[PDB]
mmCIF file of N, CA and C in Angstrom:
data_model
loop_
_atom_site.group_PDB
_atom_site.id
_atom_site.type_symbol
_atom_site.label_atom_id
_atom_site.label_comp_id
_atom_site.label_asym_id
_atom_site.label_seq_id
_atom_site.Cartn_x
_atom_site.Cartn_y
_atom_site.Cartn_z
ATOM 1 N N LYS A 755 57.691 45.744 -38.617
ATOM 2 C CA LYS A 755 59.154 46.160 -38.628
ATOM 3 C C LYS A 755 59.567 46.215 -36.756
ATOM 4 N N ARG A 756 58.960 46.801 -36.332
ATOM 5 C CA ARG A 756 58.981 47.245 -34.838
ATOM 6 C C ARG A 756 59.072 45.900 -34.143
ATOM 7 N N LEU A 757 58.240 44.751 -34.448
ATOM 8 C CA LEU A 757 58.193 43.625 -33.868
ATOM 9 C C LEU A 757 59.439 42.790 -34.024
ATOM 10 N N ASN A 758 59.836 42.754 -34.975
ATOM 11 C CA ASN A 758 61.003 42.107 -35.672
ATOM 12 C C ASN A 758 62.150 42.667 -34.954
ATOM 13 N N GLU A 759 62.410 43.858 -34.887
ATOM 14 C CA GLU A 759 63.454 44.765 -34.623
ATOM 15 C C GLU A 759 63.552 44.430 -32.891
ATOM 16 N N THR A 760 62.334 44.198 -32.220
ATOM 17 C CA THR A 760 62.545 43.999 -31.159
ATOM 18 C C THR A 760 62.841 42.713 -30.384
ATOM 19 N N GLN A 761 62.247 41.833 -31.503
ATOM 20 C CA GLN A 761 63.114 40.402 -31.018
ATOM 21 C C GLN A 761 64.452 40.287 -31.402
ATOM 22 N N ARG A 762 65.108 40.998 -32.175
ATOM 23 C CA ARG A 762 66.189 41.215 -32.553
ATOM 24 C C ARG A 762 67.012 41.522 -31.682
ATOM 25 N N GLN A 763 66.595 42.553 -30.819
ATOM 26 C CA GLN A 763 67.246 43.214 -30.082
ATOM 27 C C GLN A 763 67.268 42.574 -28.529
ATOM 28 N N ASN A 764 65.975 41.836 -28.446
ATOM 29 C CA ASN A 764 66.193 40.998 -27.391
ATOM 30 C C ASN A 764 67.271 39.697 -27.415
ATOM 31 N N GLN A 765 67.171 39.390 -28.464
ATOM 32 C CA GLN A 765 68.168 38.061 -28.865
ATOM 33 C C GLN A 765 69.741 38.681 -28.905
ATOM 34 N N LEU A 766 69.819 39.913 -29.300
ATOM 35 C CA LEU A 766 70.872 40.430 -29.051
ATOM 36 C C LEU A 766 71.576 40.415 -27.539
ATOM 37 N N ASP A 767 70.864 41.027 -26.722
ATOM 38 C CA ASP A 767 71.397 41.304 -25.591
ATOM 39 C C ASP A 767 71.194 40.115 -24.587
ATOM 40 N N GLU A 768 70.506 39.155 -24.971
ATOM 41 C CA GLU A 768 70.459 37.844 -24.484
ATOM 42 C C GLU A 768 72.129 37.006 -24.819
ATOM 43 N N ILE A 769 72.301 37.144 -26.181
ATOM 44 C CA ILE A 769 73.416 36.694 -26.620
ATOM 45 C C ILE A 769 74.733 36.985 -25.717
ATOM 46 N N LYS A 770 74.683 38.681 -25.577
ATOM 47 C CA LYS A 770 75.489 39.022 -24.822
ATOM 48 C C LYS A 770 75.372 38.894 -23.234
ATOM 49 N N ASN A 771 74.659 38.727 -22.662
ATOM 50 C CA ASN A 771 74.686 37.949 -21.180
ATOM 51 C C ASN A 771 75.376 36.450 -21.216
ATOM 52 N N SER A 772 74.816 35.813 -22.332
ATOM 53 C CA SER A 772 75.692 34.440 -22.245
ATOM 54 C C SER A 772 77.207 34.392 -22.450
ATOM 55 N N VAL A 773 77.399 35.602 -23.306
ATOM 56 C CA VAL A 773 78.781 35.594 -23.390
ATOM 57 C C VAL A 773 79.572 36.070 -22.186
ATOM 58 N N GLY A 774 78.984 37.258 -21.538
ATOM 59 C CA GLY A 774 79.605 37.191 -20.286
ATOM 60 C C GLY A 774 79.653 36.100 -19.164
ATOM 61 N N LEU A 775 78.636 35.167 -19.244
ATOM 62 C CA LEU A 775 78.555 34.232 -18.500
ATOM 63 C C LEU A 775 79.615 33.178 -18.602
ATOM 64 N N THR A 776 79.687 32.899 -20.079
ATOM 65 C CA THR A 776 81.028 31.782 -20.478
ATOM 66 C C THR A 776 82.288 32.346 -20.208
ATOM 67 N N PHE A 777 82.414 33.780 -20.150
ATOM 68 C CA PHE A 777 83.831 34.475 -19.991
ATOM 69 C C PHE A 777 84.123 34.415 -18.779
ATOM 70 N N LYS A 778 82.970 34.521 -17.703
ATOM 71 C CA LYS A 778 83.303 34.309 -16.405
ATOM 72 C C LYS A 778 83.611 32.746 -15.700
ATOM 73 N N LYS A 779 83.031 32.003 -16.650
ATOM 74 C CA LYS A 779 83.397 30.623 -16.313
ATOM 75 C C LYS A 779 84.813 30.102 -16.758
ATOM 76 N N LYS A 780 85.086 30.628 -17.847
ATOM 77 C CA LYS A 780 86.736 30.620 -18.125
ATOM 78 C C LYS A 780 87.697 30.900 -17.083
ATOM 79 N N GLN A 781 87.317 32.379 -16.911
ATOM 80 C CA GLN A 781 88.077 33.235 -15.978
ATOM 81 C C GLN A 781 88.234 32.378 -14.500
ATOM 82 N N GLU A 782 87.236 31.642 -14.250
ATOM 83 C CA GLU A 782 87.083 30.977 -12.905
ATOM 84 C C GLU A 782 87.721 29.429 -13.353
ATOM 85 N N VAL A 783 87.862 28.977 -14.432
ATOM 86 C CA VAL A 783 88.942 27.594 -14.331
ATOM 87 C C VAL A 783 90.123 27.752 -14.693
ATOM 88 N N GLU A 784 90.733 28.962 -14.983
ATOM 89 C CA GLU A 784 92.062 29.246 -15.137
ATOM 90 C C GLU A 784 92.999 28.825 -13.664
ATOM 91 N N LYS A 785 92.209 29.312 -12.743
ATOM 92 C CA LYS A 785 93.169 28.996 -11.364
ATOM 93 C C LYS A 785 93.117 27.388 -11.092
ATOM 94 N N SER A 786 92.151 26.684 -11.191
ATOM 95 C CA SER A 786 92.143 25.055 -11.306
ATOM 96 C C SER A 786 93.086 24.678 -12.067
ATOM 97 N N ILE A 787 93.130 25.212 -13.485
ATOM 98 C CA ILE A 787 94.179 24.692 -14.550
ATOM 99 C C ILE A 787 95.616 24.754 -13.860
ATOM 100 N N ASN A 788 95.946 25.981 -13.252
ATOM 101 C CA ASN A 788 97.373 26.183 -12.701
ATOM 102 C C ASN A 788 97.356 25.481 -11.477
ATOM 103 N N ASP A 789 96.731 25.324 -10.902
ATOM 104 C CA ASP A 789 96.941 24.281 -9.611
ATOM 105 C C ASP A 789 97.080 22.845 -9.971
ATOM 106 N N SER A 790 96.348 22.636 -10.766
ATOM 107 C CA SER A 790 96.500 21.260 -11.400
ATOM 108 C C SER A 790 97.826 21.089 -12.185
ATOM 109 N N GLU A 791 98.316 22.013 -12.716
ATOM 110 C CA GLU A 791 99.742 22.074 -13.353
ATOM 111 C C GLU A 791 100.890 21.989 -11.980
ATOM 112 N N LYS A 792 100.468 22.772 -11.068
ATOM 113 C CA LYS A 792 101.666 22.882 -9.947
ATOM 114 C C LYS A 792 101.743 21.341 -9.415
ATOM 115 N N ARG A 793 100.675 20.513 -9.022
ATOM 116 C CA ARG A 793 100.584 19.241 -8.569
ATOM 117 C C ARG A 793 101.165 18.369 -9.456
ATOM 118 N N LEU A 794 100.791 18.501 -10.784
ATOM 119 C CA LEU A 794 101.641 17.500 -11.686
ATOM 120 C C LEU A 794 103.091 17.967 -11.658
ATOM 121 N N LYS A 795 103.506 19.114 -11.455
ATOM 122 C CA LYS A 795 105.020 19.407 -11.233
ATOM 123 C C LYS A 795 105.495 18.476 -10.001
ATOM 124 N N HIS A 796 104.737 18.647 -8.937
ATOM 125 C CA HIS A 796 105.273 17.791 -7.786
ATOM 126 C C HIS A 796 105.258 16.464 -7.836
ATOM 127 N N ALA A 797 104.290 15.742 -8.531
ATOM 128 C CA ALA A 797 103.975 14.547 -9.270
ATOM 129 C C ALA A 797 105.202 13.967 -9.943
ATOM 130 N N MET A 798 106.003 15.049 -10.844
ATOM 131 C CA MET A 798 106.981 14.761 -11.483
ATOM 132 C C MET A 798 108.235 14.242 -10.676
ATOM 133 N N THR A 799 108.482 15.605 -9.698
ATOM 134 C CA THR A 799 109.536 15.386 -8.797
ATOM 135 C C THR A 799 109.509 14.240 -7.850
ATOM 136 N N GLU A 800 108.417 13.611 -7.399
ATOM 137 C CA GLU A 800 108.439 12.472 -6.697
ATOM 138 C C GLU A 800 108.340 11.080 -7.874
ATOM 139 N N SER A 801 108.144 11.563 -8.934
ATOM 140 C CA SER A 801 108.269 10.506 -10.120
ATOM 141 C C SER A 801 109.832 10.113 -9.973
ATOM 142 N N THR A 802 110.647 11.213 -10.150
ATOM 143 C CA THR A 802 112.070 11.064 -10.605
ATOM 144 C C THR A 802 112.918 10.816 -9.644
ATOM 145 N N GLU B 1323 10.878 59.023 10.174
ATOM 146 C CA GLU B 1323 11.576 59.318 11.292
ATOM 147 C C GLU B 1323 11.769 60.407 11.873
ATOM 148 N N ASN B 1324 12.076 61.663 10.732
ATOM 149 C CA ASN B 1324 12.633 63.059 11.452
ATOM 150 C C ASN B 1324 11.060 63.549 11.564
ATOM 151 N N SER B 1325 11.322 64.556 12.559
ATOM 152 C CA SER B 1325 10.007 65.730 12.584
ATOM 153 C C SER B 1325 10.138 66.638 11.697
ATOM 154 N N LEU B 1326 11.488 66.711 11.101
ATOM 155 C CA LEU B 1326 11.488 68.003 10.125
ATOM 156 C C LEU B 1326 10.754 67.766 8.805
ATOM 157 N N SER B 1327 11.156 66.615 8.156
ATOM 158 C CA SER B 1327 10.041 65.930 7.513
ATOM 159 C C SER B 1327 9.518 66.559 6.447
ATOM 160 N N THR B 1328 10.105 67.103 5.531
ATOM 161 C CA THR B 1328 9.415 67.935 4.528
ATOM 162 C C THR B 1328 8.473 67.329 3.433
ATOM 163 N N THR B 1329 7.236 68.235 3.370
ATOM 164 C CA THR B 1329 6.195 67.557 2.805
ATOM 165 C C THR B 1329 5.315 68.436 1.484
ATOM 166 N N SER B 1330 5.806 68.232 0.455
ATOM 167 C CA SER B 1330 5.365 68.778 -0.699
ATOM 168 C C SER B 1330 5.394 68.206 -1.902
ATOM 169 N N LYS B 1331 4.319 67.780 -2.495
ATOM 170 C CA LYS B 1331 4.229 66.876 -3.767
ATOM 171 C C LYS B 1331 4.018 67.917 -4.939
ATOM 172 N N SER B 1332 5.140 68.324 -5.157
ATOM 173 C CA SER B 1332 4.838 69.266 -6.682
ATOM 174 C C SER B 1332 6.342 69.183 -7.100
ATOM 175 N N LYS B 1333 6.474 69.214 -8.490
ATOM 176 C CA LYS B 1333 7.657 69.269 -9.066
ATOM 177 C C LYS B 1333 8.615 70.582 -8.844
ATOM 178 N N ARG B 1334 9.753 70.252 -8.193
ATOM 179 C CA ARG B 1334 10.306 71.668 -8.229
ATOM 180 C C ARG B 1334 10.719 72.303 -9.751
ATOM 181 N N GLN B 1335 11.048 73.690 -9.619
ATOM 182 C CA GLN B 1335 10.883 74.187 -10.991
ATOM 183 C C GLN B 1335 12.776 74.464 -11.241
ATOM 184 N N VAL B 1336 13.428 74.216 -12.259
ATOM 185 C CA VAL B 1336 14.851 73.799 -12.650
ATOM 186 C C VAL B 1336 15.195 75.225 -12.390
ATOM 187 N N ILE B 1337 16.653 74.983 -11.737
ATOM 188 C CA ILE B 1337 17.192 76.216 -11.360
ATOM 189 C C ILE B 1337 18.572 76.598 -12.377
ATOM 190 N N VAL B 1338 19.461 75.374 -12.571
ATOM 191 C CA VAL B 1338 20.508 75.660 -13.324
ATOM 192 C C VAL B 1338 20.318 74.938 -14.418
ATOM 193 N N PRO B 1339 20.948 74.782 -15.581
ATOM 194 C CA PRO B 1339 21.165 73.793 -16.482
ATOM 195 C C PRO B 1339 22.728 72.956 -16.387
ATOM 196 N N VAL B 1340 22.538 72.016 -16.967
ATOM 197 C CA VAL B 1340 23.870 70.806 -17.176
ATOM 198 C C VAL B 1340 24.419 71.420 -18.325
ATOM 199 N N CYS B 1341 25.917 71.759 -17.922
ATOM 200 C CA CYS B 1341 26.887 72.071 -19.001
ATOM 201 C C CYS B 1341 28.079 71.024 -19.033
ATOM 202 N N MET B 1342 28.989 71.696 -19.650
ATOM 203 C CA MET B 1342 30.382 70.995 -19.650
ATOM 204 C C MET B 1342 31.170 71.242 -18.287
ATOM 205 N N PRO B 1343 31.627 70.584 -17.394
ATOM 206 C CA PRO B 1343 32.350 70.996 -16.340
ATOM 207 C C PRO B 1343 33.637 71.848 -16.452
ATOM 208 N N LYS B 1344 33.765 72.897 -15.900
ATOM 209 C CA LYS B 1344 34.789 73.868 -16.255
ATOM 210 C C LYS B 1344 36.046 73.278 -15.184
ATOM 211 N N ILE B 1345 36.799 72.262 -15.800
ATOM 212 C CA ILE B 1345 37.918 71.749 -15.166
ATOM 213 C C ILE B 1345 38.776 71.427 -16.538
ATOM 214 N N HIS B 1346 40.194 71.500 -16.160
ATOM 215 C CA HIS B 1346 40.995 71.280 -17.412
ATOM 216 C C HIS B 1346 42.121 70.484 -16.842
ATOM 217 N N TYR B 1347 41.999 69.982 -15.654
ATOM 218 C CA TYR B 1347 43.207 68.857 -15.336
ATOM 219 C C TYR B 1347 42.275 67.576 -14.946
ATOM 220 N N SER B 1348 42.672 66.398 -15.464
ATOM 221 C CA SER B 1348 42.771 64.977 -15.265
ATOM 222 C C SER B 1348 40.901 64.609 -15.447
ATOM 223 N N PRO B 1349 40.403 64.866 -16.679
ATOM 224 C CA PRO B 1349 39.774 63.605 -17.452
ATOM 225 C C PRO B 1349 40.880 63.271 -18.608
ATOM 226 N N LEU B 1350 41.805 63.841 -18.675
ATOM 227 C CA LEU B 1350 42.914 63.860 -19.509
ATOM 228 C C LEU B 1350 43.759 62.739 -19.086
ATOM 229 N N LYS B 1351 44.564 62.462 -19.968
ATOM 230 C CA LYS B 1351 45.876 61.318 -19.610
ATOM 231 C C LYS B 1351 47.134 61.699 -19.621
ATOM 232 N N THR B 1352 47.945 60.973 -19.282
ATOM 233 C CA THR B 1352 49.749 61.316 -19.244
ATOM 234 C C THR B 1352 50.313 60.803 -20.371
ATOM 235 N N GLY B 1353 50.779 61.768 -21.135
ATOM 236 C CA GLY B 1353 51.851 61.439 -22.225
ATOM 237 C C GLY B 1353 52.852 60.725 -22.192
ATOM 238 N N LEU B 1354 53.336 59.618 -22.629
ATOM 239 C CA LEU B 1354 54.539 58.992 -22.772
ATOM 240 C C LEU B 1354 55.178 59.032 -24.211
ATOM 241 N N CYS B 1355 56.502 58.955 -24.256
ATOM 242 C CA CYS B 1355 57.192 59.087 -25.197
ATOM 243 C C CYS B 1355 58.339 57.934 -25.307
ATOM 244 N N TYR B 1356 58.198 57.155 -26.386
ATOM 245 C CA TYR B 1356 59.063 56.197 -26.412
ATOM 246 C C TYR B 1356 59.532 55.335 -28.002
ATOM 247 N N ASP B 1357 60.289 54.878 -28.273
ATOM 248 C CA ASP B 1357 60.747 54.220 -29.676
ATOM 249 C C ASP B 1357 61.828 53.323 -29.444
ATOM 250 N N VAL B 1358 61.912 52.136 -30.187
ATOM 251 C CA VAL B 1358 62.849 51.074 -30.152
ATOM 252 C C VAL B 1358 63.860 51.745 -30.990
ATOM 253 N N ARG B 1359 63.840 52.789 -31.949
ATOM 254 C CA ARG B 1359 65.113 53.465 -32.544
ATOM 255 C C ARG B 1359 66.052 53.893 -31.774
ATOM 256 N N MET B 1360 65.771 54.381 -30.393
ATOM 257 C CA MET B 1360 66.830 54.672 -29.601
ATOM 258 C C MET B 1360 67.833 53.407 -29.105
ATOM 259 N N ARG B 1361 67.375 51.953 -29.364
ATOM 260 C CA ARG B 1361 67.976 51.128 -28.938
ATOM 261 C C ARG B 1361 69.114 50.663 -30.102
ATOM 262 N N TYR B 1362 69.374 51.541 -31.161
ATOM 263 C CA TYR B 1362 70.310 51.367 -32.162
ATOM 264 C C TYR B 1362 71.791 51.518 -31.811
ATOM 265 N N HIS B 1363 71.737 52.119 -31.074
ATOM 266 C CA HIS B 1363 73.198 52.951 -30.692
ATOM 267 C C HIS B 1363 73.619 52.176 -29.651
ATOM 268 N N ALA B 1364 74.808 51.165 -29.775
ATOM 269 C CA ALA B 1364 75.302 50.327 -28.781
ATOM 270 C C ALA B 1364 76.928 50.548 -28.912
ATOM 271 N N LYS B 1365 77.496 49.983 -28.142
ATOM 272 C CA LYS B 1365 79.329 50.164 -28.032
ATOM 273 C C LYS B 1365 79.811 49.328 -28.701
ATOM 274 N N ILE B 1366 81.102 49.646 -29.309
ATOM 275 C CA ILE B 1366 82.043 48.750 -29.995
ATOM 276 C C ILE B 1366 82.844 48.242 -28.867
ATOM 277 N N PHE B 1367 82.896 46.770 -28.368
ATOM 278 C CA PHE B 1367 83.496 46.137 -27.564
ATOM 279 C C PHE B 1367 85.016 45.924 -27.986
ATOM 280 N N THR B 1368 85.920 46.721 -27.642
ATOM 281 C CA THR B 1368 87.036 47.048 -28.185
ATOM 282 C C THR B 1368 88.381 46.279 -27.379
ATOM 283 N N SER B 1369 88.307 46.560 -26.061
ATOM 284 C CA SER B 1369 89.594 46.132 -25.508
ATOM 285 C C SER B 1369 89.448 44.459 -25.121
ATOM 286 N N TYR B 1370 88.621 44.059 -24.413
ATOM 287 C CA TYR B 1370 88.291 42.449 -24.381
ATOM 288 C C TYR B 1370 86.821 42.301 -24.394
#
């Protein structure tokens, strides 16, 4: 019981670490999304 | 080598007997307390 509980807890906080990792990667790709939108805007101006 | 050099071939008579040593620290160990059942209590991720 203690063995399975410890493996459960290790799986738990490893999942929590990976969740923090992917949330940081999303929070860092947001800025390049907005900058790419800005250059699409300027591309539309020169298109017109 | 020495000039002191005691010289008597005879069995020395016994003086003291061997008893339990009268110490009470450190033939013993150091106690540890631990259980995984403290790892049950976690936080509810609520804000984001």
